[PDB]
C-alpha cells in the first residue's frame, strides 16, 4: 500500500488543480453530443476517488492507466486548441510531471 500512499497525494493534487474542472466528473452524454459513441471506456477523477476509496485499485500501475485513460480520452474527443483540450494537456502533463516524481 506504499504504492497507494502516492496515490492519494496525487490524486487530492489534480482534484484541486486549476484545469482540472473538465475531469471532476464523469461526462454527461446526454449533454456532449457524439460522446457515448467516441469514448468506450470514460474516466473521470471522482470514479477514481470511488475506487481508491474503496481500494479497489491492486497497485498503483491500475491507478496510472485509469489517470491516462482521463487524458486518452481527453485528446480523442476534443480538439488541442479547445478549451477542454488544452486543460487536458495542463493536467497530463502534470500528473506525468508529478508521477515520475515518486518512481
Ligand atoms: C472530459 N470532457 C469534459 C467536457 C466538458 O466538461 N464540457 C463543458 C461542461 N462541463 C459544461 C457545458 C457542457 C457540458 C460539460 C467536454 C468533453 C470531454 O471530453
Not at 464523469?26 to 460522446?35: A, E, H, K, T
Request: proline letters at 4%; one cysteine or more; hydrophobic letters at 40%.
Amino acid at each position: 500500500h506504499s504504492d497507494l500512499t502516492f496515490c492519494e497525494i496525487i490524486l487530492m493534487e489534480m482534484e484541486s488543480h486549476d484545469a482540472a474542472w473538465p475531469f471532476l466528473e464523469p461526462v454527461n452524454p446526454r449533454l456532449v453530443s457524439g460522446y457515448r459513441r467516441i469514448i468506450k471506456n470514460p474516466m473521470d477523477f471522482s470514479t477514481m476517488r470511488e475506487r481508491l476509496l474503496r481500494g479497489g485499485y491492486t497497485s498503483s500501475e491500475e491507478f496510472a492507466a485509469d489517470a491516462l485513460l482521463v487524458f486518452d480520452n481527453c485528446q480523442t474527443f476534443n480538439e488541442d486548441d479547445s478549451e477542454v483540450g488544452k486543460a487536458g494537456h495542463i493536467m497530463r502533463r502534470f500528473f506525468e510531471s508529478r508521477w515520475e516524481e515518486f518512481y
